[PDB]
Design a protein around this ligand. Structure first.
Ligand SMILES: [Ca+2]
Length: 356
């Protein structure tokens, strides 16, 4: 499928480039992810972005701190509106932190997952007939481990005190987020719960040019940890690495690869603070945060295709094994000491093997 989105051909090398892309055109001839729910645990969403409407569920906001959420109270609330994660001043988040504008990170990641495609508007997305369940866990200066753990439980169909039962349990969780520290009990138990309910958990390896074993949730057991490659098919300068990394997706190499080829392109906003300070746009961002949703959406294409053929969905372990075994070996040598998994996720090869 060669969709008609105006910016797809020029910008979206991560979808269609022969060395650095995920082989999406051919995969789309087989599945678009219809009938699957991918939970995006992230900064929230711009629910009325014109290139996302139609593919979103209401979701929920698990941030339990008014200063972080920019809401009126410390309560968790329905919906996942991103209020903006900007920070006005240096050193507000930690020593040497630098002031920055709102990211709309969650809207970009949700775009990779399920941006409306072949609709004559903006960009394409990978599992563009799936639905995104936006679960807001990150705001000003990031988020809280206990919030993120409860979001994992709820997203995957588990019960959380004080939140109404999730009517839309997710077959796939994407966590484009990370922090220092090896995986603890709280994270691990929530992840184990999600796995026990059949949910595949896909996480970003992290951007510290360091061993993924030292960060969470990258280092958790049972998850798919995703490194980042460039348009060239080689490791990015920032990607974490190590034996915990299962495979990679296109994260964008940054300035070395120029514009557009250094960045992943999706729905976003140019707003610097609140949503109202700017307007809907398409933004280029680089990171393992951009690689992870490519792999999460391929998981959604596979589950969709199985369901469509009256076959059983894969269990989480089988899903990880499949994504690894079908990854495209890297077209540039990866150094021995910085392994980033078996290859770049290959949407078509994953579908072909699942449907054999
Ligand atoms: Ca579009």
């Amino acid at each position: 499928l060669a969709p008609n989105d105006p910016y797809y051909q020029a910008y979206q090398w991560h979808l269609h480039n022969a060395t650095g892309g995920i082989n999406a055109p051919s995969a789309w001839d087989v599945s678009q992810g219809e009938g699957v729910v991918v939970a995006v645990l992230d900064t929230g969403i711009l629910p009325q972005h014109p290139d996302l409407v139609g593919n979103l569920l209401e979701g929920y906001d698990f941030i339990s701190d008014a200063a972080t959420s920019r809401r009126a109270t410390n309560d968790r609330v329905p919906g996942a509106q991103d209020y903006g994660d900007w920070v006005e001043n240096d050193n507000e988040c930690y020593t040497g932190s630098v002031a920055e504008d709102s990211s709309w990170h969650g809207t970009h990641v949700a775009g990779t997952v399920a941006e409306q495609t072949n609709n004559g508007v903006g960009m394409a997305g990978v599992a563009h007939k799936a639905k995104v369940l936006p679960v807001r866990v990150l705001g000003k200066c990031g988020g809280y481990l206990s919030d993120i753990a409860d979001a994992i439980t709820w997203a995957s169909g588990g019960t959380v005190a004080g939140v109404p039962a999730n009517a839309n349990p997710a077959e796939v969780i994407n966590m484009s987020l990370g922090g220092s520290g090896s995986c603890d009990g709280t994270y691990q138990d929530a992840i184990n719960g999600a796995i026990s309910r059949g949910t595949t958990v896909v996480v970003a390896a992290g951007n510290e040019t360091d061993n993924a074993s030292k960060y969470r949730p990258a280092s958790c057991d049972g998850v798919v940890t995703v490194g980042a490659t460039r348009i060239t098919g080689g490791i990015t300068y920032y990607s974490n690495y190590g034996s915990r990394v299962d495979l990679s997706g296109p994260g964008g190499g940054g300035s070395v690869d120029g514009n557009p080829g250094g960045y992943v392109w999706q729905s976003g906003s140019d707003a610097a603070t609140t949503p109202e300070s700017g307007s809907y746009s398409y933004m280029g961002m680089g990171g393992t945060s951009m690689a992870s949703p490519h792999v999460a959406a391929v998981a959604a294409l596979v589950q969709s295709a199985l369901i469509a053929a009256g076959k059983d969905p894969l269990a989480p372990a089988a899903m990880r094994t499949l994504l690894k075994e079908t990854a495209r070996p890297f077209p540039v040598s990866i150094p021995t000491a910085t392994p980033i998994g078996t290859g770049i996720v290959d949407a078509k090869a994953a579908l072909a093997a699942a449907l054999e």
